[PDB]
Design a protein around this nucleic acid. Structure first.
Ligand SMILES: [Zn+2]
Lengths: 206, 179, 165, 116, 121, 71, 22
RNA sequence: UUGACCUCAAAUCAGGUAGGACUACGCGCUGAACAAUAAGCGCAGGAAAAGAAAAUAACCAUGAUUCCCUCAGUAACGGUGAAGCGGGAAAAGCUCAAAUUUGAAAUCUGGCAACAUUUCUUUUGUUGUCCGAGUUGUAAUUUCAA
RNA sequence: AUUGGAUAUGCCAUAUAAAGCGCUUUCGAAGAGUCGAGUUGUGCAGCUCUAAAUGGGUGGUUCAUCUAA
RNA sequence: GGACAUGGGUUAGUCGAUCCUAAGAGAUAGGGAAGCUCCGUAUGAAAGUUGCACGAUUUUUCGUGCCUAUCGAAAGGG
RNA sequence: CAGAAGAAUCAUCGAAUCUUUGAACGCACUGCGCCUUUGGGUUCUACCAAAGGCAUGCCUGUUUGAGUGUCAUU
């Protein structure tokens, strides 16, 4: 078998990130929110999607016609997105729930967010894929989402989601996110490495 | 299974690399012939410069230990796969300074007992000497007159080192003698 | 803003996070070619402050140059030759190991309309900015030739004879 | 390498033409801006008074000019220079105040839509 | 010699037929010269050659103007129809692109433009 | 024979064995120029040929590189 | 002998041509 | 199973762009024997480079750059050889990154379609619409003089 | 003919807009394998090590000045 | 006169070249190098000119199976 | 000289033509190909000709894909 170079790079990077010792700030992203709660998170998030580019123009031209003939509204409620915008919201202590993508490509973009969210007192969760967050906000990718205000109808729903994240993500893991990650080896890998280690330690010290 | 799919990926990565290193070595004629047929051994000059410093007390042992906490010591190699380590040593290897004294000491260690015996010091010296011996055994005045007047290069019927005279340089010759 | 956290996080280049990522990315960059396209900057904070905007016409190219002339100056000159239809805006440092120093070079397409219609990058479309990297007019090129204001940094041997002297 | 000055008369006339070309572009207004008065920085020269670069932000403010309209009416601004003594401040305030009294400012054309 | 304005008032098929008959006339006159001609025949060689050029010019001009009509108000037109000043001029910033300013610089010139003033001596 | 006609510069300086002209440097893209050969440059520089296009650019500059037809 | 050398030899033999008398 | 995204490819894919010449002046690199020189190499323009102080000075202070005169064969270094001040030429200032637009990505390329426009059927845009780029950040706002 | 910046004048103008100045019981982000230290070459570069926040640079007898990457 | 002048003269489906390969050279992949450039020739290349075949057309959005440079000879091969 | 009778070996110049090469670009250095379309002749599944195409690096976009890369999906 002869894999292409880019396919070989992909799979080696997968194994390499496992064998190495991942620091606690980077290993906490290996432990994401469970599948049930993530579904409930995105149910609430999909009631606050920002309006589409067509739907916004549809609304604006509707109001433009009214003034063109002859002529006050409510504050829009939606989900907050954008790394700089969300980080500014967390430092402002305005965010109620921060949802960090688990595979942001340069990981240091989000590596401080769990600590910043815990410093400011914001309930946060790490959810799977940057594309699920992107889907909510009509983008291809969202490194992080945040909820600051919801309608009075969904105040009780958000209070249930926040408790579930607290019970299933923060109360859980917790100590597991303070431990260096990695070093995971296959079923037969330690035995092979033990033979290699004892052979090397015998006389192969140069 | 997440674990089982992980385990077979490591096996495939390991096995394909071993195939690559095998067929890469097969290009060597000597390697093919070779296949057809706790301690430590200081053999690297880098280690010898270090070993000399510890023994000679020039560099304090406590300072050496502190100098060992650097960017490279914290890049641990415990358990990494061969396809990763092999390139890491080839590329990510810190190049420590090298002293001539360790170079001499390594040459002394590498000096075998029969490296320079009586024959290899006498006939080997003899063959070079006799070779050099076989290697070792292995102006005309022209007057610028007649057809030789106004020449620019080697004239007709003149070979080897030669000198040209025109009877006008006689005046300069006498003046030079008087000088 | 997250660009403050990235700036202060890139200051500690041997901490646990920054040392783990340095090796992982250094091996990754070694698998690829010596000069390969970078889809996005690995340091969005540093590229941003060096002139890079995340729009069409801005290009990032990653290059590794052997250690042991400035390595950064070599990085821009090798990339600019490789991508000859672009202009070398600036460059920065991303990673390094015992053999290589890794750089990312920000280039700009002078034939793109998003560049030619941008009043803040129009200056690079004029022909006098042809190969800034080659003439020592980049940030590292200026430094390598001592261009600066202070005392730290043909009128001598010429004889100036006036009409009435 | 010998430098010659055979184009010294040619250079002098070219600059006089360049001054003339400036006046063609901008006729009712002077071909030079108004420079301030400053004192040279040495014990050898501090008795004298020469022309500086621009009027400090305090000299403009004391005179009554803002730093935005100063360049429009031809008054250079020097953000670097400062007034360490009242003597330098009062000297350059009157240099501007004489300038403003001797200045004619032609009105521009202001666009104004149908409604407000 | 055929008058060019008369040629421009005719159709291409008529022009092609005249070109064919002019080429036959030129071929015969060349044959007569190499077989022994006279003063009149040698004078007719250059006149016919210049007339063939006139026919080809008119046909080519009509073809190009037909192409320009088709590509009028198109974003992309054939290269030989585009401008050719110099390679550098074609690559320079257009006057619209050059004159583009930021909103910051637009507000500066709108509120603080360079005034017209005068100093009383 | 040790030299043949170079296709680029038309001089009988194309070395048979090295496949390289000694006058211009063909097949290299850049022509062979050497400042110590000051007379060598003036023998084959601009102006030693038809210079047909450059004369057209020189003539078209005065009117502003205009196009179109008159009235 | 290619076309090229045939034309080169022809022009070489056309250079040493007697001058026209007019 | 179906689908999102990341990365990487392919096309005689839609539209572009690079090369070579000249090289007096200009900017880099390299560099001898006897000179930031010649040669060699790279890269531009009608000028290039420099340029709005991590600058001088020790004054009653000066105020981007460039060039000229002067400083001055002076100080310093040990024959080499400046610079601050001073006189003059010309003068013009500024743009970003780092701020949450968050009561609304307000930003932009391209296709198609009309409409104008032209040194010009050759140029350059506008208006509409659609697909995309973009939240891993495009506009407005701010650049410490604030 | 082809053009430039003005002047006069017509039409249009998305001003629910934009700006200067002045006031503050409210705030004010400032560029890192960079500076620097050590060493080896010719301020600059390589190598090793590698920062700070009234911090840092450069001058002068604590002060002055400046605000790099 | 092999000089000069003026004209004329070389006709191929079967003769040679054209095609193939030889030692070697050589671009491409990648890697060096401040650099003019050098190493490298199936090398850790996604290396297929319409690689090939199959199918009542497959949720009228393609599924299944198979196999996996060029130059260099007017005396070599044809 | 002959010959011809808006002339001209005229000027200007804004429209065109511009063979083979050359940065030289289908591959080679007398040649050898491929792709699209059109045309001919005692004459048509053959042969021939003509026109328009086919270099490389890179940028923006488009379409088509690959991945035991990251996931979602009662
Ligand atoms: Zn040649």
């Amino acid at each position: 078998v002869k894999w292409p170079e880019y396919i070989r790079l992909q799979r080696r990077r997968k194994i390499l990130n496992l064998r190495l010792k991942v620091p606690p700030a980077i290993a906490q992203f290996q432990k994401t929110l469970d599948k049930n709660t993530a579904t409930q998170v995105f149910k609430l998030l999909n009631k606050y999607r920002p309006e589409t580019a067509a739907e916004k123009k549809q609304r604006l031209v509707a109001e433009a016609e009214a003034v063109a003939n002859g002529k006050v509204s409510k504050k829009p409620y939606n989900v907050k997105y954008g790394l700089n915008h969300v980080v500014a919201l967390i430092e402002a202590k305005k965010a109620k729930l921060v949802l960090i993508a688990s595979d942001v490509d340069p990981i240091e973009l989000v590596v401080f967010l769990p600590a910043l969210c815990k410093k400011m007192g914001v309930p946060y969760a790490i959810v799977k894929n940057k594309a699920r967050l992107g889907t909510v906000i009509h983008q291809k990718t969202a490194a992080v989402l945040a909820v600051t205000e919801v309608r009075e109808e969904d105040k009780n729903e958000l209070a249930s989601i926040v408790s579930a994240v607290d019970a299933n993500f923060s109360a859980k893991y917790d100590e597991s996110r303070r431990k260096w990650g990695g070093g995971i080896m296959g079923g037969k890998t330690q035995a092979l490495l033990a033979k290699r280690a004892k052979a090397a330690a015998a006389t192969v010290r140069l | 299974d997440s674990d089982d799919e992980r385990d077979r990926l490591e096996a495939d990565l390991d096995s394909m690399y071993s195939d690559y290193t095998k067929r890469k070595a097969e290009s060597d004629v000597k390697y093919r012939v070779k296949k057809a047929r706790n301690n430590v051994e200081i053999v690297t000059a880098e280690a010898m410069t270090l070993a000399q410093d510890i023994a000679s007390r020039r560099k304090s042992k406590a300072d050496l230990i502190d100098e060992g906490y650097n960017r490279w010591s914290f890049q641990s190699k415990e358990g990494l796969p061969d396809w990763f380590l092999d390139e890491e040593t080839t590329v990510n290897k810190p190049n420590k300074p090298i002293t001539k004294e360790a170079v001499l000491a390594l040459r002394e260690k590498m000096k075998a007992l029969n490296a320079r015996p009586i024959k290899k010091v006498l006939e080997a010296q003899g063959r070079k000497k006799m070779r050099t011996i076989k290697r070792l055994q292995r102006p005309t005045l022209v007057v610028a007159k007649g057809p030789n007047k106004g020449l620019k290069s080697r004239p007709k019927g003149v070979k080897g080192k030669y000198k040209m005279v025109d009877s006008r340089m006689k005046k300069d010759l006498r003046a030079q003698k008087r000088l | 803003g997250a660009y403050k956290y990235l700036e202060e996080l890139a200051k500690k280049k041997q901490s646990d996070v920054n040392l783990f990522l340095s090796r992982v990315r250094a091996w990754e960059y070694r698998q690829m070619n010596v000069i390969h396209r970078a889809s996005r900057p690995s340091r969005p904070d540093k590229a941003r402050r060096l002139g890079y905007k995340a729009k069409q016409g801005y290009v990032i190219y990653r290059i590794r140059v052997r250690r042991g002339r400035s390595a950064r100056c070599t990085a821009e000159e090798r990339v600019g030759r490789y991508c000859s239809n672009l202009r070398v805006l600036n460059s920065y440092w991303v990673n390094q190991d015992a053999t290589y120093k890794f750089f990312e070079v920000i280039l700009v397409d002078p034939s793109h309309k998003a560049i030619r219609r941008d009043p803040r990058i129009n200056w690079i479309v004029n022909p006098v900015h042809k190969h800034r990297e080659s003439r020592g007019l980049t940030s590292i090129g200026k430094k390598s030739r001592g261009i600066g204001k202070g005392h730290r940094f043909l009128r001598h041997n010429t004889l100036s004879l006036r009409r009435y002297r | 390498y010998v430098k010659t000055w055979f184009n010294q008369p040619g250079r002098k006339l070219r600059r006089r033409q360049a001054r003339q070309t400036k006046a063609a572009k901008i006729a009712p207004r002077p071909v030079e801006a108004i420079r301030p008065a400053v004192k040279p920085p040495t014990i050898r020269y501090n008795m004298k008074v020469r022309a500086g670069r621009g009027f400090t932000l305090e000299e403009l403010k004391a005179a009554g000019v803002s730093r935005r309209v100063a360049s429009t009416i031809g008054i250079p601004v020097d953000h670097r220079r400062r007034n360490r003594s009242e003597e330098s401040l009062q000297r350059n305030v009157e240099r501007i105040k004489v300038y403003l009294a001797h200045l004619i400012v032609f009105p521009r054309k202001a666009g104004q839509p149908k409604k407000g | 010699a055929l008058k060019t304005f008369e040629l421009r008032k005719q159709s291409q098929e008529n022009l092609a037929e005249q070109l064919q008959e002019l080429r036959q006339e030129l071929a015969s006159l060349r044959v007569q010269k190499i077989a022994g001609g006279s003063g009149s025949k040698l004078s007719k060689i250059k006149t016919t050659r210049k007339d063939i050029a006139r026919i080809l010019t008119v046909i080519n001009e009509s073809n190009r103007l037909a192409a320009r009509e088709a590509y009028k108000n198109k974003k992309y037109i054939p290269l030989d129809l585009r401008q050719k000043k110099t390679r550098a001029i074609r690559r320079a910033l257009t006057p619209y692109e050059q004159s583009r300013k930021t909103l910051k610089q637009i507000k500066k010139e709108r509120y603080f433009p360079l005034r017209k003033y005068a100093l009383k001596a | 024979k040790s030299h043949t006609i170079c296709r680029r510069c038309g001089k009988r300086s194309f070395h048979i064995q090295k496949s390289t002209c000694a006058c211009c440097g063909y097949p290299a893209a850049k022509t062979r120029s050497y400042n110590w050969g000051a007379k060598a440059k003036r023998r084959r520089t601009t102006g030693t040929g038809r210079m047909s296009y450059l004369k057209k650019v020189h003539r078209s500059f005065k009117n502003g590189f205009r196009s179109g037809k008159p009235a | 002998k290619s076309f090229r050398t045939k034309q080169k030899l022809a022009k070489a033999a056309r250079q040493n041509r007697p001058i026209p008398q007019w």
